Ligand binder design. Structure first.
Ligand SMILES: [Ca+2]
Ligand SMILES: [Ca+2]
Ligand SMILES: [Ca+2]
Length: 229
């Protein structure tokens, strides 16, 4: 018997449940062969990839459909090589390469991340007794920014947006003075500040995915009110 292509390829999102049929590429005589309906397919141990035959399974020898037996993880292993035996009841093998696709199992992280990430506290300073027109937008060091820890969601159209907010802060009148744009994390002064009533603000900034699976990250934001001096 003789496989019809030199190689076969398949892709699988890591969120794919066990039980799912993940390859059907032998359908329509595309497997190994006048076809007789007597060629049966089996998965084999691969010295090069010992886990591969534990992870994939062929329930129906005649059909050759590969089903997923164990969960996958894009963040751990991204490529498998499955050896498929094809015997006639009247042997050859081929190699299926299964690539794992990145699924949405992680939320954002604030930048810069320095290894996981150390606690990040952003810095901003506000001169007292000046108008918002003079100061806006407030410069933050380093610039507030978060990215999805899922580094390779495909296509990009599937990628979630990121929403930024102020979860909490002290003193608690921060919302009088500060607004954060949900989509740009831009920070605006709303009113002038007098240092004799307000010296500093410690806020917790939140980044969440906008796709119903928030998985939020958090980061500090320390704002000093600078003395007119
Ligand atoms: Ca994963
Ligand atoms: Ca992922
Ligand atoms: Ca994600």
């Amino acid at each position: 018997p003789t496989f019809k292509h030199e190689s076969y390829y398949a892709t699988v999102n890591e969120l794919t449940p066990v039980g799912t049929t993940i390859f059907t590429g032998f359908s329509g005589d595309n497997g190994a062969t006048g076809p007789n309906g007597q060629i049966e397919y089996v998965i084999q141990y691969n010295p090069d990839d010992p886990t591969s035959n534990d992870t994939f399974e062929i329930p129906l020898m005649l059909t050759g459909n590969i089903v997923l037996r164990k969960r996958l993880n894009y963040e751990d292993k991204t490529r498998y090589f499955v050896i498929i035996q094809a015997n006639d009841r009247a042997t050859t093998t081929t190699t299926l390469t299964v690539d794992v696709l990145d699924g949405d199992d992680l939320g954002p992280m604030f930048l810069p991340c320095v290894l996981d990430c150390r606690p990040l506290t952003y810095q901003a300073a506000i001169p007292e007794l000046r108008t918002p027109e003079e100061l806006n937008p407030i410069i933050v060091t380093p610039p507030i920014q978060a990215i999805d820890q899922d580094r390779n969601i495909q296509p990009p159209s599937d990628r979630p947006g990121i929403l930024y907010s102020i979860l909490v802060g002290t003193p608690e009148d921060y919302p009088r003075f500060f607004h954060m744009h949900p989509r740009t994390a831009e920070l605006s002064l709303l009113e002038p500040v007098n240092r004799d009533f307000h010296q500093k603000f410690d806020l917790v900034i939140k980044a969440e995915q906008d796709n119903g699976h928030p998985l939020p990250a958090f980061a500090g934001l320390h704002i000093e009110i600078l003395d007119e001096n």
